[PDB]
UniProtKB/Swiss-Prot annotation:
One of its GO terms (cellular component) is cytoplasm. It is an enzyme of class 3 (hydrolase). The gene is NUDT1. This is Oxidized purine nucleoside triphosphate hydrolase. Monomer. It comes from Homo sapiens. Widely expressed with highest expression in thymus, testis, embryo and proliferating blood lymphocytes.
Length: 154
């Protein structure tokens, strides 16, 4: 009982792109760009699609950086999130009714206004490490338990 998702971080040498989510689950937080993988779609194709749908950017090159499983108490389905990173994009970020993309300098990442798990795995992302994570949440604010380990292959 896990559902496949993707999550894309646009990480350049001095800045990262995040999107403020305007509606529904995780509204009011800065997010990477992601969503559910579709029937007959590869995980990487889904990641590329989600980046365009949510940011307006076209990815030229993607690489795998992690897998994170999320459990929410009272929710039967686990979220199996495949995380990707790129430095190489085309287009300019687009604000839509759903998302407002903004660049952040790396020492100004707005963790207080991000999912709480990000504090744990962003240090690894920023140093080009790969990882496997598991986070058990109660509601959107509380991590009950987690695991996080660096890996050589995602
Ligand atoms: C169709 C997707 C429904 C929204 C998923 C809400 N659950 C959830 C739980 C914990 C999370 N922790 C971190 C982040 C993140 O962006 N860190 C930079 C999350 N963003 C995320 C956005 C889309 C798909 C998958 C993950 C995230 C999302």
């Amino acid at each position: 009982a896990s559902r496949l998702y993707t999550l894309v971080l646009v990480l350049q040498p001095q800045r990262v792109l995040l999107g403020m989510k305007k509606r529904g689950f995780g509204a009011g937080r800065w997010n990477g760009f992601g969503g559910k993988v579709q029937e007959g779609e590869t995980i990487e194709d889904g990641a590329r699609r989600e980046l365009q749908e949510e940011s307006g950017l076209t990815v030229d090159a993607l690489h795998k950086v992690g897998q994170i499983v999320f459990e929410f108490v009272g929710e039967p389905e686990l979220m199996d999130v495949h995380v990707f990173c790129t430095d190489s994009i085309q287009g300019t970020p687009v604000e839509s009714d759903e998302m407002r993309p903004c660049w952040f300098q790396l020492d100004q990442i707005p963790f207080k206004d991000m999912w709480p798990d990000d504090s744990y795995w962003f240090p690894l992302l920023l140093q080009k490490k790969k990882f496997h994570g598991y986070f058990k949440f109660q509601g959107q604010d509380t991590i009950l338990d987690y695991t996080l380990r660096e890996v050589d292959t995602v």
